[PDB]
Amino acid sequence: TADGYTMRLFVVAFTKPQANQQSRNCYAKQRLVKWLRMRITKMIKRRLSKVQIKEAVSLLTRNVLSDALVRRCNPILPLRELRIRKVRVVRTPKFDAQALLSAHGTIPASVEADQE
Amino acid sequence: MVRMHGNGRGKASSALPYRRTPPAWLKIASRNVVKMVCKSSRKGMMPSQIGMELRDSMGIAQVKNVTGRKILRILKHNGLAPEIPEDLYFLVKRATQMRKHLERHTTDRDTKYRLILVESRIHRLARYYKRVKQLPPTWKYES
Amino acid sequence: MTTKRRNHGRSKPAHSRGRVKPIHCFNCGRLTPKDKAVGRFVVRRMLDAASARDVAEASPVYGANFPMPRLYMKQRFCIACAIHSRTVRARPVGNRKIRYTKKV
Amino acid sequence: VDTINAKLQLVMKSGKYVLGTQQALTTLRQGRSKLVVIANNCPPIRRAEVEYYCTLSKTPIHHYSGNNLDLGTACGKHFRTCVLSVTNVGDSDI
Amino acid sequence: GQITEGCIVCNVEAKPGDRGTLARASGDYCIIISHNHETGRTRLKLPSGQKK
Amino acid sequence: GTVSRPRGMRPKWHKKRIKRLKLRRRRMRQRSK
Amino acid sequence: GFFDADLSYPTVRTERMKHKRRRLVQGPNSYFMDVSCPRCRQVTVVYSHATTSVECKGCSKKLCRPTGGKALLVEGCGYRRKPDH
Amino acid sequence: AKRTVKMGVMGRYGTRYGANPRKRAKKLEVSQHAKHFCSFCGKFAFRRKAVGIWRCDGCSKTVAGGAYTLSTPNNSTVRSTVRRLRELA
RNA sequence: CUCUAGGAAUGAAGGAGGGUAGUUCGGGGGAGAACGUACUGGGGCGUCAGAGGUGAAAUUCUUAGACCGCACCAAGACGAACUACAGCGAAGGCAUUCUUCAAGGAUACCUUCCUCAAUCAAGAACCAAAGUGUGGAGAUCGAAGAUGAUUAGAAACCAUUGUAGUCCACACUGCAAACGAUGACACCCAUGAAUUGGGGAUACUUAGUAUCUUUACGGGAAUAUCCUCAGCACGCACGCGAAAGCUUUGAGGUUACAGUCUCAGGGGGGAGUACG
RNA sequence: CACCAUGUU
Ligand SMILES: [K+]
Ligand SMILES: [K+]
Ligand SMILES: [K+]
Ligand SMILES: [Mg+2]
Ligand SMILES: [Mg+2]
Ligand SMILES: [Mg+2]
Ligand SMILES: [Mg+2]
Ligand SMILES: [Mg+2]
Ligand SMILES: [Mg+2]
Ligand SMILES: [Mg+2]
Ligand SMILES: [Mg+2]
Ligand SMILES: [Mg+2]
Ligand SMILES: [Mg+2]
Ligand SMILES: [Mg+2]
Ligand SMILES: [Mg+2]
Ligand SMILES: [Mg+2]
Ligand SMILES: [Mg+2]
Ligand SMILES: [Mg+2]
Ligand SMILES: [Mg+2]
Ligand SMILES: [Mg+2]
Ligand SMILES: [Mg+2]
Ligand SMILES: [Mg+2]
Ligand SMILES: [Mg+2]
Ligand SMILES: [Mg+2]
Ligand SMILES: [Mg+2]
Ligand SMILES: [Mg+2]
Ligand SMILES: [Mg+2]
Ligand SMILES: [Mg+2]
Ligand SMILES: [Mg+2]
Ligand SMILES: [Mg+2]
Ligand SMILES: [Mg+2]
Ligand SMILES: [Mg+2]
Ligand SMILES: [Mg+2]
Ligand SMILES: [Mg+2]
Ligand SMILES: [Mg+2]
Ligand SMILES: [Zn+2]
């Protein structure tokens, strides 16, 4: 990411039969599978490398990235479902108190220390 | 290719027409086709390649049907024939490229197996060419 | 002796492939080829009908609209294990060739 | 590389060539060289000296992908060659 | 500190400026495990398998 | 049961007996030559 | 009643479906077209199943693209099957 | 005519020292006395001049590597790793 | 005006070999870098009396904190679901991704060539597992061994472990129900529904057709109908067989006995033993 | 899924 976060993303996609298809299977050709994998890799790398970790989290939570991935990959291969199975942060930058503060905005108060 | 070294049973090939005469729209004279064949050979093309360029871009389906002679026969009449027959040239070239690859990849056992077939093909082909005097006697393929 | 099955009890035709890597049986762990093992994909509810209705009452999330999660698991058995667990039984000679292609 | 090897085979059969550093430098001195090919294991001082002559004479220069043993083989020879100079291209269209 | 993880090294200085005291016998080498920029220390695997 | 009547012990264990017997005879001739 | 198929004189229905080497007398499936340059109006003969890429002798750009079967002609060029004989 | 059946250069030891120790030493003895390819100068002229020291007759270059062979298998892998790590930076 | 020995050669096998192309097709082979949970171990952070294991137990671990819980670290294996009477490979075998290196098959062709072929003593190469040698590696499982059970006995099956092994590199070994218990090449051969890869189309003189996605490995991809070549097969007409069964995938086209080559067998044991 | 060995010609 732009603020020095390294994220590993895991995307799983499934082929689907067409509406009028009568075949017993909808296995995909390996050439199209590799093409789909490369397009997914390029779109995710291009979209997420120029944003901050806060914006990247929003892109993943509201399924804006997933919607664009399945929109640009369906012409390659008819897809039953494209889903980002897992996202993991693997490397973090050095801690920055101001960066943490700006990601939290107005912190709600806690009454746990307050007398009952 | 198919029925020698590998039990493949492919049938893909060309089917020459029953009517051998060139089509009426072919306006290229026989002596001009011979010129293109020799000029192509001097550029380094082999007879299989030469016939494809004439077929693809010049409308000559069969050089023999136009001039009465085959591509290799024309080259032999002009001293442009390859020193080694073309099919033996490509088999020897493939064996050289596989042996060079096997220098680094010593554990590629499938490639080693394929090399035995290629070199077995070369020796069978060289025996035939030595018999019909297309190769010098005591011509040898060496690794 | 006499050949019991044209299939020889697996799904490996004479010229399809040489070796299929074995799998461990679901029950006893016997190694059996993956094409030969009896494979069942079972979808199991976490709780029975009586237990599901009790947990749903105390659940602000699970109810008439939100279904409770199920158990998904592909089970591959040894031949002996599949016969003992009654997922598969011996059949009359005529009915041995009956094959099913979907869960019924 | 196969493309340069294919044209080298054409030069060997149709054109005129010279093998060896000393003979190649002579062709560069009289401006009779059409192309100079240098193996990848040429000594750095000799490679720089041949390159300087090519720059002065505006002679095209090609860096071969093999060593002098590979370059010698590509010319149909049984000996190594560090530098090759083409004085007549024949029909190789180099 | 200028050498990447996993690089094979020899003639390693146990102390800075000792002019090489580790991995000096024939065929021997050290493997760099990691660096720690906070304390300025580098971790390596010695030819005997010990980590230092 | 998967094979027919053997008429003897299991052939694999009969093979092991012969192999063990062949080895013993091989060593006995070693200490006499 | 239906017409029985004569082996010596097969009907056009059955013979058309046959493979080129499985016909009563084998023959080619290929032909030549007259291709005019998309921006030259120069006509060059192009093989239907050409695998070597063909230029326009004056235009000097691609006229067809090799495929696994019939060649793919460039966009915006006229062509017509030259008669087989 | 071939002068020995199984042992070659090991025939100088006669019947001494045992067959298995002779066989293990033969593989390294043959390699330490053989001509190795010189990457410089493209010749098969590299000869050992002491343990770990190789001098090419063709170009007079001296190279340090290997007790009984010009380049150990570990060095070939190490050379590849170093170049790979150099390109990563 | 100059040169002028140059076109007279059966045909290209639904035989073999080469060529070109989709930069085609695939768990095919080799190299490199990564990734994934899990088993085991390790600390860190919590908790407290059991945990484990079985038919039931015990060996075993545990307030010196086991088990369990969360996020991590190390190391070596392995590549779940998708995974199929599916693909690739001569067989043995082959399943994460990306980058690479030589190949291999099918298909397409009015390219090339011109019997170069089929099958084989001798000879050669490859060949699961176990085993052997030398270096590594050593998580898991685990011959031998140990302990606990069960039993009339149990050094068996079961439980807790554990050595060699299991993994890698190099070199040997050449045995498997190495099976389709079915040698290789070629010909003929009825029917229905499918499937993998590549192409083509949208006793008659020619007979149809669509759907979905669609800002860049994109004049694309997948589908529908029809045809075709090659591949693994299913339910099923002659015919065959002692029968079980086989059947364009023969074990059919054989006493109406002859396409070609090659290997092996001659009642059961002794015995794949003895000798060399 | 505890333990069930044998039967003179
Ligand atoms: K604790
Ligand atoms: K054996
Ligand atoms: K009894
Ligand atoms: Mg499909
Ligand atoms: Mg043969
Ligand atoms: Mg196959
Ligand atoms: Mg097998
Ligand atoms: Mg089964
Ligand atoms: Mg039974
Ligand atoms: Mg039975
Ligand atoms: Mg029997
Ligand atoms: Mg017995
Ligand atoms: Mg032919
Ligand atoms: Mg690869
Ligand atoms: Mg743990
Ligand atoms: Mg812990
Ligand atoms: Mg997987
Ligand atoms: Mg093994
Ligand atoms: Mg060891
Ligand atoms: Mg008892
Ligand atoms: Mg006893
Ligand atoms: Mg006991
Ligand atoms: Mg006891
Ligand atoms: Mg015990
Ligand atoms: Mg004891
Ligand atoms: Mg055997
Ligand atoms: Mg079998
Ligand atoms: Mg078979
Ligand atoms: Mg047998
Ligand atoms: Mg066989
Ligand atoms: Mg296929
Ligand atoms: Mg098809
Ligand atoms: Mg007979
Ligand atoms: Mg007998
Ligand atoms: Mg008794
Ligand atoms: Zn040298």
PDB file of N, CA and C (backbone and C1' of nucleotides) in Angstrom, chain I residues 210-238:
ATOM      1  P     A I 210     -30.092 -17.772 -35.761  1.00  0.00           P
ATOM      2  O5'   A I 210     -30.072 -17.621 -34.175  1.00  0.00           O
ATOM      3  C5'   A I 210     -31.274 -17.410 -33.450  1.00  0.00           C
ATOM      4  C4'   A I 210     -31.268 -18.158 -32.140  1.00  0.00           C
ATOM      5  C3'   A I 210     -30.587 -17.458 -30.973  1.00  0.00           C
ATOM      6  O3'   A I 210     -31.406 -16.496 -30.333  1.00  0.00           O
ATOM      7  C1'   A I 210     -29.781 -19.656 -31.117  1.00  0.00           C
ATOM      8  P     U I 211     -30.743 -15.193 -29.666  1.00  0.00           P
ATOM      9  O5'   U I 211     -30.047 -15.746 -28.343  1.00  0.00           O
ATOM     10  C5'   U I 211     -30.813 -16.360 -27.318  1.00  0.00           C
ATOM     11  C4'   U I 211     -29.944 -16.818 -26.175  1.00  0.00           C
ATOM     12  C3'   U I 211     -29.081 -15.749 -25.523  1.00  0.00           C
ATOM     13  O3'   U I 211     -29.793 -14.935 -24.608  1.00  0.00           O
ATOM     14  C1'   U I 211     -27.771 -17.666 -25.928  1.00  0.00           C
ATOM     15  P     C I 212     -29.355 -13.404 -24.394  1.00  0.00           P
ATOM     16  O5'   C I 212     -28.058 -13.500 -23.474  1.00  0.00           O
ATOM     17  C5'   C I 212     -28.136 -14.041 -22.165  1.00  0.00           C
ATOM     18  C4'   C I 212     -26.769 -14.220 -21.553  1.00  0.00           C
ATOM     19  C3'   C I 212     -25.874 -12.993 -21.538  1.00  0.00           C
ATOM     20  O3'   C I 212     -26.185 -12.085 -20.497  1.00  0.00           O
ATOM     21  C1'   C I 212     -24.636 -14.855 -22.290  1.00  0.00           C
ATOM     22  P     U I 213     -25.884 -10.518 -20.677  1.00  0.00           P
ATOM     23  O5'   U I 213     -24.313 -10.398 -20.439  1.00  0.00           O
ATOM     24  C5'   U I 213     -23.739 -10.769 -19.196  1.00  0.00           C
ATOM     25  C4'   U I 213     -22.236 -10.833 -19.269  1.00  0.00           C
ATOM     26  C3'   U I 213     -21.533  -9.601 -19.814  1.00  0.00           C
ATOM     27  O3'   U I 213     -21.427  -8.551 -18.870  1.00  0.00           O
ATOM     28  C1'   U I 213     -20.616 -11.526 -20.815  1.00  0.00           C
ATOM     29  P     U I 214     -21.668  -7.031 -19.334  1.00  0.00           P
ATOM     30  O5'   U I 214     -20.442  -6.721 -20.303  1.00  0.00           O
ATOM     31  C5'   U I 214     -19.107  -6.770 -19.822  1.00  0.00           C
ATOM     32  C4'   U I 214     -18.107  -6.871 -20.947  1.00  0.00           C
ATOM     33  C3'   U I 214     -18.061  -5.699 -21.912  1.00  0.00           C
ATOM     34  O3'   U I 214     -17.329  -4.599 -21.406  1.00  0.00           O
ATOM     35  C1'   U I 214     -18.060  -7.720 -23.130  1.00  0.00           C
ATOM     36  P     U I 215     -18.057  -3.188 -21.158  1.00  0.00           P
ATOM     37  O5'   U I 215     -16.892  -2.261 -20.595  1.00  0.00           O
ATOM     38  C5'   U I 215     -15.606  -2.271 -21.202  1.00  0.00           C
ATOM     39  C4'   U I 215     -14.502  -2.122 -20.185  1.00  0.00           C
ATOM     40  C3'   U I 215     -14.305  -0.709 -19.646  1.00  0.00           C
ATOM     41  O3'   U I 215     -13.839  -0.773 -18.298  1.00  0.00           O
ATOM     42  C1'   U I 215     -12.348  -1.402 -20.786  1.00  0.00           C
ATOM     43  P     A I 216      -3.614  -1.891 -20.695  1.00  0.00           P
ATOM     44  O5'   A I 216      -4.863  -2.693 -20.121  1.00  0.00           O
ATOM     45  C5'   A I 216      -6.027  -2.899 -20.914  1.00  0.00           C
ATOM     46  C4'   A I 216      -6.700  -4.207 -20.584  1.00  0.00           C
ATOM     47  C3'   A I 216      -5.912  -5.459 -20.969  1.00  0.00           C
ATOM     48  O3'   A I 216      -6.157  -6.487 -20.012  1.00  0.00           O
ATOM     49  C1'   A I 216      -7.999  -5.474 -22.065  1.00  0.00           C
ATOM     50  P     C I 217      -4.986  -7.507 -19.601  1.00  0.00           P
ATOM     51  O5'   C I 217      -4.698  -8.327 -20.936  1.00  0.00           O
ATOM     52  C5'   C I 217      -3.825  -9.451 -20.922  1.00  0.00           C
ATOM     53  C4'   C I 217      -3.292  -9.779 -22.295  1.00  0.00           C
ATOM     54  C3'   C I 217      -4.336 -10.228 -23.315  1.00  0.00           C
ATOM     55  O3'   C I 217      -3.928  -9.820 -24.623  1.00  0.00           O
ATOM     56  C1'   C I 217      -2.765 -11.956 -22.992  1.00  0.00           C
ATOM     57  P     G I 218      -4.726  -8.665 -25.404  1.00  0.00           P
ATOM     58  O5'   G I 218      -5.460  -9.428 -26.595  1.00  0.00           O
ATOM     59  C5'   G I 218      -6.432 -10.435 -26.334  1.00  0.00           C
ATOM     60  C4'   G I 218      -7.679 -10.238 -27.162  1.00  0.00           C
ATOM     61  C3'   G I 218      -7.764  -8.905 -27.902  1.00  0.00           C
ATOM     62  O3'   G I 218      -8.513  -9.085 -29.103  1.00  0.00           O
ATOM     63  C1'   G I 218      -9.556  -9.068 -26.379  1.00  0.00           C
ATOM     64  P     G I 219      -7.941  -8.556 -30.508  1.00  0.00           P
ATOM     65  O5'   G I 219      -9.151  -8.780 -31.520  1.00  0.00           O
ATOM     66  C5'   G I 219     -10.472  -8.397 -31.168  1.00  0.00           C
ATOM     67  C4'   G I 219     -11.395  -8.436 -32.358  1.00  0.00           C
ATOM     68  C3'   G I 219     -11.543  -9.786 -33.043  1.00  0.00           C
ATOM     69  O3'   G I 219     -12.461 -10.643 -32.388  1.00  0.00           O
ATOM     70  C1'   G I 219     -11.150  -8.129 -34.671  1.00  0.00           C
ATOM     71  P     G I 220     -12.320 -12.237 -32.537  1.00  0.00           P
ATOM     72  O5'   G I 220     -11.910 -12.723 -31.079  1.00  0.00           O
ATOM     73  C5'   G I 220     -10.717 -12.261 -30.464  1.00  0.00           C
ATOM     74  C4'   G I 220     -10.839 -12.268 -28.962  1.00  0.00           C
ATOM     75  C3'   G I 220     -11.515 -13.491 -28.365  1.00  0.00           C
ATOM     76  O3'   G I 220     -10.638 -14.596 -28.241  1.00  0.00           O
ATOM     77  C1'   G I 220     -12.437 -11.540 -27.409  1.00  0.00           C
ATOM     78  P     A I 221     -11.189 -16.090 -28.446  1.00  0.00           P
ATOM     79  O5'   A I 221     -11.978 -16.392 -27.099  1.00  0.00           O
ATOM     80  C5'   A I 221     -11.323 -16.304 -25.843  1.00  0.00           C
ATOM     81  C4'   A I 221     -12.297 -16.455 -24.705  1.00  0.00           C
ATOM     82  C3'   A I 221     -13.305 -17.580 -24.844  1.00  0.00           C
ATOM     83  O3'   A I 221     -12.771 -18.853 -24.535  1.00  0.00           O
ATOM     84  C1'   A I 221     -14.422 -15.624 -24.168  1.00  0.00           C
ATOM     85  P     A I 222     -13.238 -20.140 -25.373  1.00  0.00           P
ATOM     86  O5'   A I 222     -14.574 -20.598 -24.642  1.00  0.00           O
ATOM     87  C5'   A I 222     -14.608 -20.736 -23.231  1.00  0.00           C
ATOM     88  C4'   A I 222     -16.008 -20.593 -22.690  1.00  0.00           C
ATOM     89  C3'   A I 222     -17.051 -21.516 -23.291  1.00  0.00           C
ATOM     90  O3'   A I 222     -17.004 -22.821 -22.747  1.00  0.00           O
ATOM     91  C1'   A I 222     -17.908 -19.322 -23.209  1.00  0.00           C
ATOM     92  P     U I 223     -17.722 -24.039 -23.507  1.00  0.00           P
ATOM     93  O5'   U I 223     -19.245 -23.899 -23.072  1.00  0.00           O
ATOM     94  C5'   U I 223     -20.282 -24.431 -23.877  1.00  0.00           C
ATOM     95  C4'   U I 223     -21.477 -23.518 -23.890  1.00  0.00           C
ATOM     96  C3'   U I 223     -22.567 -23.877 -24.881  1.00  0.00           C
ATOM     97  O3'   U I 223     -23.414 -24.904 -24.400  1.00  0.00           O
ATOM     98  C1'   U I 223     -22.088 -21.573 -25.046  1.00  0.00           C
ATOM     99  P     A I 224     -23.512 -26.296 -25.190  1.00  0.00           P
ATOM    100  O5'   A I 224     -24.652 -26.029 -26.264  1.00  0.00           O
ATOM    101  C5'   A I 224     -25.879 -25.432 -25.876  1.00  0.00           C
ATOM    102  C4'   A I 224     -26.700 -25.042 -27.074  1.00  0.00           C
ATOM    103  C3'   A I 224     -26.601 -25.977 -28.266  1.00  0.00           C
ATOM    104  O3'   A I 224     -27.419 -27.125 -28.128  1.00  0.00           O
ATOM    105  C1'   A I 224     -26.354 -23.751 -28.998  1.00  0.00           C
ATOM    106  P     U I 225     -26.852 -28.568 -28.540  1.00  0.00           P
ATOM    107  O5'   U I 225     -27.130 -28.646 -30.104  1.00  0.00           O
ATOM    108  C5'   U I 225     -28.425 -28.379 -30.620  1.00  0.00           C
ATOM    109  C4'   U I 225     -28.380 -28.097 -32.100  1.00  0.00           C
ATOM    110  C3'   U I 225     -27.526 -29.039 -32.929  1.00  0.00           C
ATOM    111  O3'   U I 225     -28.170 -30.268 -33.214  1.00  0.00           O
ATOM    112  C1'   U I 225     -27.060 -26.812 -33.548  1.00  0.00           C
ATOM    113  P     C I 226     -27.334 -31.638 -33.191  1.00  0.00           P
ATOM    114  O5'   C I 226     -26.529 -31.615 -34.564  1.00  0.00           O
ATOM    115  C5'   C I 226     -27.221 -31.581 -35.801  1.00  0.00           C
ATOM    116  C4'   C I 226     -26.300 -31.275 -36.954  1.00  0.00           C
ATOM    117  C3'   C I 226     -25.037 -32.110 -37.053  1.00  0.00           C
ATOM    118  O3'   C I 226     -25.256 -33.410 -37.570  1.00  0.00           O
ATOM    119  C1'   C I 226     -24.509 -29.843 -37.426  1.00  0.00           C
ATOM    120  P     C I 227     -24.288 -34.616 -37.137  1.00  0.00           P
ATOM    121  O5'   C I 227     -22.951 -34.349 -37.959  1.00  0.00           O
ATOM    122  C5'   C I 227     -22.977 -34.275 -39.375  1.00  0.00           C
ATOM    123  C4'   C I 227     -21.685 -33.739 -39.935  1.00  0.00           C
ATOM    124  C3'   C I 227     -20.416 -34.462 -39.525  1.00  0.00           C
ATOM    125  O3'   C I 227     -20.217 -35.679 -40.221  1.00  0.00           O
ATOM    126  C1'   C I 227     -20.070 -32.131 -39.397  1.00  0.00           C
ATOM    127  P     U I 228     -19.470 -36.904 -39.501  1.00  0.00           P
ATOM    128  O5'   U I 228     -17.944 -36.455 -39.464  1.00  0.00           O
ATOM    129  C5'   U I 228     -17.231 -36.219 -40.667  1.00  0.00           C
ATOM    130  C4'   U I 228     -15.955 -35.455 -40.426  1.00  0.00           C
ATOM    131  C3'   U I 228     -14.938 -36.122 -39.518  1.00  0.00           C
ATOM    132  O3'   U I 228     -14.185 -37.122 -40.179  1.00  0.00           O
ATOM    133  C1'   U I 228     -15.171 -33.854 -38.904  1.00  0.00           C
ATOM    134  P     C I 229     -13.985 -38.561 -39.497  1.00  0.00           P
ATOM    135  O5'   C I 229     -12.514 -38.494 -38.899  1.00  0.00           O
ATOM    136  C5'   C I 229     -11.404 -38.204 -39.734  1.00  0.00           C
ATOM    137  C4'   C I 229     -10.262 -37.617 -38.948  1.00  0.00           C
ATOM    138  C3'   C I 229      -9.861 -38.371 -37.693  1.00  0.00           C
ATOM    139  O3'   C I 229      -9.058 -39.506 -37.954  1.00  0.00           O
ATOM    140  C1'   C I 229     -10.017 -36.069 -37.206  1.00  0.00           C
ATOM    141  P     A I 230      -9.226 -40.829 -37.060  1.00  0.00           P
ATOM    142  O5'   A I 230      -8.462 -40.477 -35.710  1.00  0.00           O
ATOM    143  C5'   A I 230      -7.079 -40.162 -35.721  1.00  0.00           C
ATOM    144  C4'   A I 230      -6.642 -39.526 -34.427  1.00  0.00           C
ATOM    145  C3'   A I 230      -7.036 -40.253 -33.153  1.00  0.00           C
ATOM    146  O3'   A I 230      -6.225 -41.377 -32.864  1.00  0.00           O
ATOM    147  C1'   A I 230      -7.499 -37.962 -32.909  1.00  0.00           C
ATOM    148  P     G I 231      -6.869 -42.659 -32.143  1.00  0.00           P
ATOM    149  O5'   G I 231      -7.004 -42.215 -30.621  1.00  0.00           O
ATOM    150  C5'   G I 231      -5.883 -41.706 -29.917  1.00  0.00           C
ATOM    151  C4'   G I 231      -6.255 -41.202 -28.546  1.00  0.00           C
ATOM    152  C3'   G I 231      -7.137 -42.104 -27.708  1.00  0.00           C
ATOM    153  O3'   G I 231      -6.448 -43.209 -27.157  1.00  0.00           O
ATOM    154  C1'   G I 231      -7.883 -39.876 -27.517  1.00  0.00           C
ATOM    155  P     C I 232      -7.246 -44.565 -26.853  1.00  0.00           P
ATOM    156  O5'   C I 232      -7.937 -44.280 -25.452  1.00  0.00           O
ATOM    157  C5'   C I 232      -7.156 -43.897 -24.335  1.00  0.00           C
ATOM    158  C4'   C I 232      -8.007 -43.657 -23.119  1.00  0.00           C
ATOM    159  C3'   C I 232      -9.112 -44.660 -22.857  1.00  0.00           C
ATOM    160  O3'   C I 232      -8.653 -45.886 -22.321  1.00  0.00           O
ATOM    161  C1'   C I 232      -9.934 -42.477 -22.522  1.00  0.00           C
ATOM    162  P     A I 233      -9.521 -47.218 -22.536  1.00  0.00           P
ATOM    163  O5'   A I 233     -10.821 -46.953 -21.663  1.00  0.00           O
ATOM    164  C5'   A I 233     -12.103 -47.376 -22.090  1.00  0.00           C
ATOM    165  C4'   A I 233     -13.178 -46.527 -21.468  1.00  0.00           C
ATOM    166  C3'   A I 233     -14.594 -47.070 -21.549  1.00  0.00           C
ATOM    167  O3'   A I 233     -14.869 -48.028 -20.544  1.00  0.00           O
ATOM    168  C1'   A I 233     -14.590 -44.816 -22.229  1.00  0.00           C
ATOM    169  P     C I 234     -15.922 -49.209 -20.812  1.00  0.00           P
ATOM    170  O5'   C I 234     -17.341 -48.496 -20.712  1.00  0.00           O
ATOM    171  C5'   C I 234     -17.759 -47.876 -19.507  1.00  0.00           C
ATOM    172  C4'   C I 234     -19.159 -47.332 -19.620  1.00  0.00           C
ATOM    173  C3'   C I 234     -20.214 -48.295 -20.138  1.00  0.00           C
ATOM    174  O3'   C I 234     -20.672 -49.207 -19.159  1.00  0.00           O
ATOM    175  C1'   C I 234     -20.438 -46.231 -21.245  1.00  0.00           C
ATOM    176  P     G I 235     -21.147 -50.675 -19.599  1.00  0.00           P
ATOM    177  O5'   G I 235     -22.628 -50.452 -20.134  1.00  0.00           O
ATOM    178  C5'   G I 235     -23.616 -49.865 -19.305  1.00  0.00           C
ATOM    179  C4'   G I 235     -24.883 -49.569 -20.068  1.00  0.00           C
ATOM    180  C3'   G I 235     -25.465 -50.718 -20.874  1.00  0.00           C
ATOM    181  O3'   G I 235     -26.205 -51.632 -20.084  1.00  0.00           O
ATOM    182  C1'   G I 235     -25.440 -48.763 -22.195  1.00  0.00           C
ATOM    183  P     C I 236     -29.989 -50.823 -24.851  1.00  0.00           P
ATOM    184  O5'   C I 236     -29.053 -51.760 -25.735  1.00  0.00           O
ATOM    185  C5'   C I 236     -27.639 -51.605 -25.719  1.00  0.00           C
ATOM    186  C4'   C I 236     -26.982 -52.395 -26.821  1.00  0.00           C
ATOM    187  C3'   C I 236     -27.092 -53.914 -26.689  1.00  0.00           C
ATOM    188  O3'   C I 236     -27.205 -54.505 -27.982  1.00  0.00           O
ATOM    189  C1'   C I 236     -24.816 -53.283 -26.726  1.00  0.00           C
ATOM    190  P     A I 237     -27.925 -55.933 -28.151  1.00  0.00           P
ATOM    191  O5'   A I 237     -27.801 -56.246 -29.706  1.00  0.00           O
ATOM    192  C5'   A I 237     -28.752 -55.735 -30.625  1.00  0.00           C
ATOM    193  C4'   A I 237     -28.338 -56.001 -32.048  1.00  0.00           C
ATOM    194  C3'   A I 237     -27.787 -57.386 -32.334  1.00  0.00           C
ATOM    195  O3'   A I 237     -28.799 -58.367 -32.482  1.00  0.00           O
ATOM    196  C1'   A I 237     -26.385 -55.767 -33.323  1.00  0.00           C
ATOM    197  P     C I 238     -28.423 -59.927 -32.408  1.00  0.00           P
ATOM    198  O5'   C I 238     -27.703 -60.204 -33.800  1.00  0.00           O
ATOM    199  C5'   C I 238     -26.694 -61.194 -33.921  1.00  0.00           C
ATOM    200  C4'   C I 238     -25.897 -61.003 -35.185  1.00  0.00           C
ATOM    201  C3'   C I 238     -24.884 -62.089 -35.505  1.00  0.00           C
ATOM    202  O3'   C I 238     -25.471 -63.226 -36.113  1.00  0.00           O
ATOM    203  C1'   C I 238     -23.884 -59.963 -35.788  1.00  0.00           C
TER     204        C I 238
END
